[PDB]
């Protein structure tokens, strides 16, 4: 797809095999969702954002699947406000910024 | 041009006479500028992100050009610790996300 930026980018994400959603945010280094539950342990990580930081579990080796492209990645579970896809899922569907 | 996202997507503005640079952020609603001096009135505003809020001081009709393109539009300032461009200034340039 080619998406422009009048609204939110959200996407539909299948992440871990559950179907959410989340913002296509080229501002975040890192993938971080709110409403999932993965399996198994996880590690600590901390992020930091505009207003300050926030402790997160990091899960690792989590299937992500948008918009036909499945890939294997880490994702930060935490207390963001909106689940964000960050640069390191969409380096790897290849994603680009265009102007 | 077309930007990957391997590393974070820094762009050279041009706000308030000055050359800054400000990270393409499209999970930004609004560009936010950290120390810069503009004229004119301004309007008290809040911005909530990662980790809390964040004071900011709302300017209008602010040219700014970003990588060499022209845009008039909203922008904030107040102590991001990065300057951002976001979506309403994006979309002023045509940007899309692509994949
Ligand atoms: C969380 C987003 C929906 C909102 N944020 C934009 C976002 O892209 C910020 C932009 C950003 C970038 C650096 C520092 C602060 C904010 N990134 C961010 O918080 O990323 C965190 C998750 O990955 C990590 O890598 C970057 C910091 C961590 S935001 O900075 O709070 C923001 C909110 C409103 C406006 N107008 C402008 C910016
Ligand atoms: C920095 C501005 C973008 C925001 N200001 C918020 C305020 O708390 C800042 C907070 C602030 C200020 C500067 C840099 C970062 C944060 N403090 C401030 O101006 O203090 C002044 C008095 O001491 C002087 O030396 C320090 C700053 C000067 S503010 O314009 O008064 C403001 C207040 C409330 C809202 N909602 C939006 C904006």
């Known amino acids: 797809p080619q998406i422009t930026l009048w609204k ?4 539909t994400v299948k992440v871990g095999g559950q179907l959410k959603e989340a913002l296509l945010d080229t501002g975040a280094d ?3 969702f709110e409403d999932i539950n993965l399996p198994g ?9 505009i207003g300050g ?4 579990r990091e899960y690792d080796q989590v299937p992500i699947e948008i918009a036909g492209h499945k890939v294997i990645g880490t994702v930060l579970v935490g207390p963001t406000p909106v689940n ?16």
């Open 8 to 11: 939110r980018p959200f996407v």
């Open 30 to 32: 890192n993938t971080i």
């Open 41 to 49: 342990r996880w590690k600590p990580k901390m992020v930091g954002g």
């Open 53 to 56: 930081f926030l402790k997160v």
């Open 84 to 99: 964000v896809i960050g640069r390191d899922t969409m380096t790897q569907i290849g994603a680009t910024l265009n102007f």
